């Protein structure tokens, strides 16, 4: 199941 | 009259304690604004990472007024943010490589000047290069972005563990 990420928001 | 963490302008999940210096973080990044923010001259701010437990993790720096709180920092046009992990730099949601990480015990030093304009980043006294140049113009604060459960605690001044000798600035806490 999907967690928001640390990277969530980022393009690169 | 103290420059501190805004209790107007931060996001509700954030855990601000009585003094209003330290932050501990929840789940996805959000932030929190100083109560002052400053137009002109050269500024400066430390912040301490108290804990930084695993899968934790910061984005540290300066935003306008219009940076949005739910979001970390460096997300939109409006804020420039240096990442725990990795040391990246990012703005308007791009990261780019700058320095090497941050973690648990680290001394970060926040530089800005505001004349061509200056985002300077410090670990632990060392001048970590010229992260951005000719910002965005307007009023920038400095700012705090926390992913999980992680504190940090906000020193704007006067009396810094590590102040820059390679840099004329005042501390934030002239503000006040």
Known sequence: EYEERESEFDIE | ?????????????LKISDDRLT???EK?????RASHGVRKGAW?????????????????????????????????????????K???????????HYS????????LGFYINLPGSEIIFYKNGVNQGVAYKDIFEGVYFPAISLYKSCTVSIN????????????????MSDMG
């Not at chain 2, 996805?28 to 929190?32: D, K, L």
């Not at chain 2, 300066?62 to 943010?81: E, H, I, R, T």
């Not at chain 2, 001044?157 to 840099?167: A, V």
Request: aromatic share 14%; charged share 20%.
């Open chain 2, 1 to 13: 009259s103290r420059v501190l963490l805004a209790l107007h302008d931060r996001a509700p999940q």
């Open chain 2, 23 to 25: 932050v501990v973080g």
């Open chain 2, 28 to 32: 996805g990044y959000s932030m929190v």
């Open chain 2, 44 to 84: 400066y701010f430390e912040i301490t990472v108290d804990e930084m437990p695993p899968d934790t993790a910061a984005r540290l720096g300066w935003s306008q007024p219009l940076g949005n709180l739910q979001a970390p920092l460096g997300y939109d046009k409006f804020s420039y943010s240096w990442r725990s």
């Open chain 2, 86 to 96: 990795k040391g990246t730099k990012f703005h308007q949601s791009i990261g780019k």
């Open chain 2, 100 to 107: 090497s990480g941050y973690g648990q015990g680290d001394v």
């Open chain 2, 156 to 171: 704007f001044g006067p009396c810094f563990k590590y102040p820059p000798k390679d840099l004329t600035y005042r501390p």
